[PDB]
Symmetry: C2
Subunit: 158 residues, 2 copies
């Protein structure tokens, strides 16, 4: 059923170049990967400070090609399975396009991947903005971010 | 306060090339523009069939540059006014990027335009999936589409 996700990326008003993605399933499974295809030279100051230093070391198997990350996710999301998939992100318009561009144009998205991501901030506001935990130390690590989204969703829906 | 919008675009897995944008405010104001800047040749079968035919004639004043559309939206969304700006779209991830890319990077979006677009499909499901009127015949005209979203929003929230 439900997956909470986050991405880091380099975006220049034209393209969204994916750095990393973290996805946590409501059932407890977690996926994290760092693309070996983004060019770190194209990173702006803010990404260079806040995103790049938090990445795994280069010898880590967490570093995957774009094709591997897409295949990992088709497996992780159970694209062939019983369940309806619901994707959730916090202020995730760009995150949604970064995710979907792992398959290509929106035309190429597998049939069972939803064409919209539910917006966790919208849910939170619709429930009167209940108090959240303070943001983690390691924000801008996408897996840390994704785990925190699930934590919030659980708090919001209790 | 709330604006409902829709965009049409040529998207290829790499970029989103804006064809048109329609925005409708809750107070009745409407904005619609078609960009002079996208390359119609690039469009696939679907956009050639369902989008390009609905666009205004070449001599329409609705055809504007991307710079003009940004300037027009800064004025239409009342970016220096005191109301909080709330944007809504239906299944709006790519729409939101197509809108915000009129200012270039994310970084450059005026501080007063929100960094996310509320998802009307998410609201619908939430308030119990109420039966909605049928989509208009003339959908894929961004302004007709945006009007219809405002309509559905009013219906969905009418007993909130
Ligand atoms: Mg994020
Ligand atoms: Mg690859
Ligand atoms: Mg993040
Ligand atoms: Mg649309």
């Amino acid at each position: 059923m439900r997956y909470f996700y986050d991405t880091e990326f380099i975006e220049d008003g034209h393209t969204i170049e994916l750095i990393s993605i973290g996805v946590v399933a409501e059932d407890g499974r977690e996926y994290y990967a760092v693309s070996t295809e983004f060019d770190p030279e194209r990173a702006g100051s803010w990404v260079r400070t806040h995103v790049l230093p938090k990445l795994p070391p280069p010898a880590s198997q967490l570093w995957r090609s774009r094709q591997q990350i897409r295949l990992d996710l088709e497996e992780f999301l159970r694209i062939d399975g019983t369940d309806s998939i619901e994707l959730w992100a916090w202020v995730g318009a760009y995150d949604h396009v970064a995710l979907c561009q792992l398959w290509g144009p929106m035309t190429a998205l597998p049939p069972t991947v939803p064409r919209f991501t539910r917006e966790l901030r919208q849910l939170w506001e619709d429930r009167g903005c209940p108090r959240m935990p303070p943001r983690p130390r390691d924000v801008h690590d996408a897996l840390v971010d994704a785990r925190d989204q699930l934590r919030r969703f659980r708090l919001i829906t209790s």
